[PDB]
Write a protein that binds this ligand. Structure first.
Ligand SMILES: [Mg+2]
Ligand SMILES: [Mg+2]
Ligand SMILES: [Mg+2]
Ligand SMILES: [Mg+2]
Ligand SMILES: [Mg+2]
Ligand SMILES: [Mg+2]
Ligand SMILES: [Mg+2]
Ligand SMILES: [Mg+2]
Ligand SMILES: [Mg+2]
Ligand SMILES: [Mg+2]
Ligand SMILES: [Mg+2]
Ligand SMILES: [Mg+2]
Ligand SMILES: [Mg+2]
Ligand SMILES: [Mg+2]
Ligand SMILES: [Mg+2]
Ligand SMILES: [Mg+2]
Ligand SMILES: [Mg+2]
Ligand SMILES: [Mg+2]
Ligand SMILES: [Mg+2]
Ligand SMILES: [Mg+2]
Ligand SMILES: [Mg+2]
Ligand SMILES: [Mg+2]
Ligand SMILES: [Mg+2]
Lengths: 153, 148, 50, 129, 195, 109
RNA sequence: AAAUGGAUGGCGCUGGAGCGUCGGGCCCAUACCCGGCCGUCGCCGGCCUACGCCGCGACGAGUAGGAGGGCCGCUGCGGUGAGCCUUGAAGCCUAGGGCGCGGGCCCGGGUGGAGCCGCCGCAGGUGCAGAUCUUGGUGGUAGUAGCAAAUAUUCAAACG
RNA sequence: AGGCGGCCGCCCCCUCGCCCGUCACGCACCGCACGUUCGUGGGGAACCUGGCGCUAAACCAUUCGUAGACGACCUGCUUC
């Protein structure tokens, strides 16, 4: 499999992938824009604080009908939400990226996330029952997740 | 607003008004200004201001605050005001203000009995309520589908 | 059209921008006009409703 | 600086825009090819100013300089050696151009034979090792 | 570069026309003393026209719609808005080039002030016609700053009277100097070629 | 030292009310306020001078930010001394209200 | 004297930017003139693809409709190109280079992995924006409405 | 809506700080544009340099309830 953004040098770079994992695409995109470009220890502390709701994740693009929070003013934005499950899956992907840095034998402290990406996946269909005896589909929207991490100097 | 002059000492209640988080703040508001009052070269630049203030201004407003130590509230922040002095000429108004800097002003010194005196405040809070409780409009009768 | 029973209109339109105030200490919109004849005095106070 | 053909004048094209189809900007199910709008209301047919311009016979180029490359030759496609050797008589007006499905092994032999016969080849240095 | 125009005894529409044409070409023009602009016609009709203009407003939300400026500088500025193509991004740069000031600012206390002759009351109005004062009109309609502007204008006229005596003193000294001698070697050539 | 060119302000295009004619320009030119006055300026040349962040020149010494579009005066235009002009490439129409140099080129005294 | 706030177009305009009489200049449409270029038509000319070649002159709008031309295009068939290709064809993409007034085409670059085209004739189920078109897919609406008929759960431990 | 304007006393130099006249060179780049400018323009990223100083404040977490649909708003949180 390939990756968008072939990195600057694969010697100092490690990478990770997630294929067909049951999350929401929109929540994972809005939390990936929160993570992207931050150091890895700050990102791990951040995604441990998201699941305990001490610090939030801003919503920027998919901002429809999302209520306000006080914690959003760190990001210069007015709308925030605390996705548990997206933060858990992205924490697991960061742990896999940590283990791949361990296998390639790098400086485990000074990684940053140079590139991250989330895109939609082939969705699965259930169905509901709406009035006058009608059927309407009820479909998920899982995502594929790429991340490319690079050593800071 | 021409220029503002504050007094030689500023109490902790006013400093707590200037700050937001007194627990976090290092109290550093108004130290260099009091040092300007203290030193002699500061006074020369300071006494030049009251010479200019007599010359141009129509209105002099005096900044004061409440003593929160006497009150049984929990707030402990002094509220600041502007109080326009409606006395005579600007010279004696400014002499009155510099004569009474850092003094207490009792209520009996300004108001008097039987004086018809207006009140300005902020009303009660009743929250985001509806039309019939806001504008005192009339209820629709019982038979109305979707709301009365 | 021609409502057939004219009512005094509810509320006042003069107070229309109904709004939480920008300040909870009630500021003074205007102080009364001075004269040079009177001796020097003040015109305001703070108070606490009990 | 290759062959410098005969006298070719300052070519005028009268418009260089390759005229677009009406409402092809608004959709992507309309490709960019021109097609005569035959509506009963259409502003392009009514020729309102500020709308697009229909191609017609007035925009045509000069018969002296029709089908002229800016180098000064008229182009002519070629597959192999014999069809290259037909231009042995008229090289100073008609340039050769090797077709896209000619392989490199025969393509270098064609460009070498053209270099002997002094015939302009407009894409001589593509698809090499 | 800057055309500093006076406003006493000019006409509203004429001065607006000349400023509006000069501002589209780039010469940055500043209209000073806006309160002294005279409007032709009887000023009862002038307040009647501007009062009906106040009556013209949107009935659904008066915040969105016709802003009725009351200061006379803003009156003249709205009149020049009505004559420049402001919805285009040409006239918006033109209005940003244009500046206007009721009263006189401290740079324009001392900068020299031009007077447009094609817009003067003296030139345009046949003398038995009635005119207006835009200061009178603005004080009747909502501009609450006449009593400040009158005081400041008295103050600056008092300062200009103390400057003019000094300048006339210098000119008396230089004509005493030209009454003295030994400039006359050059003055024959100068009178031959237009002193 | 000293300025050799006369000052002129680009006023717009030759136009009707609705449509323009972009192959010709108009020039309000300072010091000229009469049809009789705008006769000396026929046949002179005009140049538009501007800046660009690439570095391209003519024999004026060294590479500069400066670029210039040339052209020349055709004929008088109206009573108010305004002057038609034709350039080699048409105007950017950025220059409405920006000064176009009128040079003392073809002097005919 | 009429209902939302508004219309000599607006701003405005009074030794006029109004009314009536006029003058001298000045502005400009695809109209006119001059000049270039394309096509149609006509009148020819030459014993130079004679279905080509030049020359002259007048003219060119257009729905319903009618003809002519198309070295415009798709798919197949006989003939032909000592056609083209595993040293890379078809198809696809392309801020690349061009041609034609266009229908469209040619080359460059990258994918791609086994067939493809030019010309002269021939034959068609032969060219898409629509038909509340058919089938297949995906958006905005949107992480929103909504997971509320019948009272109700709480603590500790265990396996994990 | 003021930072430019002016005076005085001292400081190292100019007595060509301007006109008329004598004298000879300076790139004379051999016909040619975008030249002269207010510019030691305006803004941002950094690099070495001497001198003068400075050692914070928001927002969150929490608490209040004069305020709240959520935000927003009023407040408290010194080791006495
Ligand atoms: Mg909501
Ligand atoms: Mg259901
Ligand atoms: Mg059923
Ligand atoms: Mg309440
Ligand atoms: Mg009912
Ligand atoms: Mg007020
Ligand atoms: Mg019709
Ligand atoms: Mg009217
Ligand atoms: Mg036709
Ligand atoms: Mg295969
Ligand atoms: Mg083909
Ligand atoms: Mg093909
Ligand atoms: Mg078939
Ligand atoms: Mg069919
Ligand atoms: Mg279709
Ligand atoms: Mg159709
Ligand atoms: Mg349909
Ligand atoms: Mg469908
Ligand atoms: Mg859908
Ligand atoms: Mg809702
Ligand atoms: Mg919901
Ligand atoms: Mg239920
Ligand atoms: Mg366990």
């Amino acid at each position: 499999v390939r990756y968008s953004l072939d990195p600057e040098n694969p010697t100092k770079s490690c990478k990770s992938r997630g294929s067909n994992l049951r999350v929401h695409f929109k929540n994972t995109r809005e939390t990936a824009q929160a993570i992207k470009g931050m150091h890895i220890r700050k990102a791990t502390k951040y995604l441990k604080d998201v699941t305990l709701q001490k610090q939030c994740v801003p919503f920027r693009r998919y901002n429809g009908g999302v209520g306000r929070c006080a914690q959003a003013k760190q990001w210069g934005w007015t709308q925030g939400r605390w996705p548990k499950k997206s933060a858990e899956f992205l924490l697991h992907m960061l742990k896999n990226a940590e283990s791949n840095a361990e296998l390639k034998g790098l400086d485990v402290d000074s990684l940053v996330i140079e590139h991250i990406q989330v895109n939609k996946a082939p969705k699965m269909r259930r169905r509901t029952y709406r009035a006058h005896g009608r059927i309407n589909p009820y479909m998920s929207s899982p995502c594929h997740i790429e991340m490319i991490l690079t050593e800071k100097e | 607003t021409f220029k503002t002059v504050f007094a030689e000492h500023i109490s902790d209640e006013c400093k707590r008004r200037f700050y937001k988080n007194w627990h976090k703040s290092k109290k550093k508001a108004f130290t260099k200004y009091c040092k300007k009052w203290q030193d002699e070269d500061g006074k020369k630049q300071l006494e030049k201001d009251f010479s200019s203030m007599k010359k141009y201004c129509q209105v002099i407003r005096v900044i004061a605050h409440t003593q929160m130590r006497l009150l049984p509230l929990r707030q402990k922040k002094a509220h600041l005001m502007e109080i326009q002095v409606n006395g005579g000429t600007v010279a004696e108004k400014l002499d009155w203000a510099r004569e009474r800097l850092e003094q207490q002003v009792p209520v009996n010194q300004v108001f008097g009995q039987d004086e018809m005196i207006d009140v300005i405040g902020v009303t009660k809070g009743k929250g985001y309520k509806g039309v019939t409780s806001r504008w005192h409009t009339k209820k629709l009768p019982r038979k109305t589908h979707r709301g009365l | 059209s021609h409502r057939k029973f004219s009512a005094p209109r509810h509320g006042s339109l003069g107070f229309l921008p109904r709004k939480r105030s920008s300040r909870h200490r009630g500021k003074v919109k205007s102080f009364p006009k001075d004269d040079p004849s009177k001796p020097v005095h003040l015109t305001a106070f703070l108070g606490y409703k009990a | 600086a290759a062959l410098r053909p005969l006298v070719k004048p300052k070519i005028v094209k009268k418009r260089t825009k390759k005229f677009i189809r009406h409402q092809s900007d608004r959709y992507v199910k309309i490709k960019r090819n021109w097609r005569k709008p035959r509506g009963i209301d259409n502003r392009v047919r009514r020729r309102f100013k500020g709308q697009i311009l229909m191609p017609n016979i007035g925009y045509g180029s000069n018969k002296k300089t029709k089908h002229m490359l800016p180098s000064g030759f008229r182009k002519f496609l070629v597959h192999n050696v014999k069809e290259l050797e037909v231009l042995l008589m008229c090289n100073k007006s008609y340039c050769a151009e090797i077709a896209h499905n000619v392989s490199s092994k025969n393509r270098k032999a064609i460009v070498e034979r053209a270099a002997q016969l002094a015939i302009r080849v407009t894409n001589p240095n593509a698809r090499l090792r | 570069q800057v055309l500093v125009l006076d406003g006493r005894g000019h006409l509203l529409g004429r001065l607006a026309a000349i400023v509006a044409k000069q501002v589209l070409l780039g010469r940055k023009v500043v209209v000073v003393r806006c309160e002294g602009i005279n409007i032709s016609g009887n000023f009862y009709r002038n307040k009647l026209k501007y009062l009906a203009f106040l009556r013209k407003r949107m009935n659904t939300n008066p915040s969105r719609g016709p802003y009725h400026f009351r200061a006379p500088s803003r009156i003249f500025w709205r009149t020049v808005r009505g004559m420049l193509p402001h919805k285009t991004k040409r006239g918006q740069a033109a209005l940003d080039r244009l500046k206007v000031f009721d009263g006189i600012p401290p740079p324009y206390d001392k900068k020299k002030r031009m007077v447009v002759p094609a817009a003067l009351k003296v030139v345009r109005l046949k003398p038995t016609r009635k005119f207006a004062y835009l200061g009178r009109l603005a004080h009747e309609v909502g501009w609450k700053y006449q009593a400040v502007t009158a005081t400041l204008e008295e103050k600056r006229k008092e300062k200009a009277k103390i400057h003019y005596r000094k300048k006339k003193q210098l000119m008396r000294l230089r004509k005493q100097a030209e009454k003295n001698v030994e400039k006359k070697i050059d003055k024959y050539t100068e009178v031959l070629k237009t002193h | 030292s000293g300025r050799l060119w006369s000052k002129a302000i680009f006023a717009g295009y030759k136009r009707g009310l609705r449509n323009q004619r972009e192959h010709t320009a108009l020039l309000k030119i300072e010091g000229v306020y009469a049809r009789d006055e705008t006769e000396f300026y026929l046949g002179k040349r005009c140049a538009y001078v501007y800046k660009a962040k690439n570095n391209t020149v003519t024999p004026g010494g060294k590479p500069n930010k400066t670029r210039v579009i040339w052209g020349k005066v055709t004929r008088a235009h109206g009573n108010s001394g305004m002057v038609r002009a034709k350039f080699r490439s048409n105007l950017p129409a950025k220059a409405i209200g920006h000064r176009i140099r009128v040079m003392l080129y073809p002097s005919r005294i």
